[PDB]
Amino acid sequence: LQNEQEKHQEMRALLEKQQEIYPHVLLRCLSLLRQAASELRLRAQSDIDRI
Amino acid sequence: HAPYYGIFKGIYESVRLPLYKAPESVLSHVADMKKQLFFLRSQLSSRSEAI
Amino acid sequence: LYQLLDGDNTQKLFRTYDGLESVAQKLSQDIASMRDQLEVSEQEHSLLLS
Structure with missing residues (x-):
């Protein structure tokens, strides 16, 4: 029981670390897609297609 | 039947x-x-900071 | 036991057994309340991630 409780605490610590890193990685992806949509598709490419 | 049994029973349950x-x-x-x-x-506190 | 639960060396001149049971109930409630807050915080976090 004591060993399983220690394992539980370790797993919990790891889970908390992963929950801290995951949202930041999603935000970086969102930031890249936003750049592609706003700077490339709505602006750069739209001007090119018009000309 | 001990005099303090009822009081400590209550403390144990609390x-x-x-x-x-x-x-x-x-x-x-x-x-x-x-x-x-x-x-x-x-x-x-750690989680609130992370959010 | 009373010192361990109340923390506050407030030299209360008269310690009662009823007071002792109340402070013990408070600790249990504080732990329960903290676990509930953590659960809420976990939901908030999960919503943000979704």
Whole structure:
């Protein structure tokens, strides 16, 4: 029981670390897609297609 | 039938200590509960900061 | 036991057994309340991630 409780605490610590890193990685992806949509598709490419 | 049985029965139930446990365990158990409270507060603060 | 639960060396001149049971109930409630807050915080976090 004591060993399983220690394992539980370790797993919990790891889970908390992963929950801290995951949202930041999603935000970086969102930031890249936003750049592609706003700077490339709505602006750069739209001007090119018009000309 | 001990004079203080009813009072301590109430204390054991309040701290969620089983009645079969030895009376010498009550202070150690309460100390651990306090330790847990500190840990939960620290976890909440860390998580609130992370969010 | 009373010192361990109340923390506050407030030299209360008269310690009662009823007071002792109340402070013990408070600790249990504080832990339960903290666990509930953590659960809420976990939901908030999960919503943000979704």
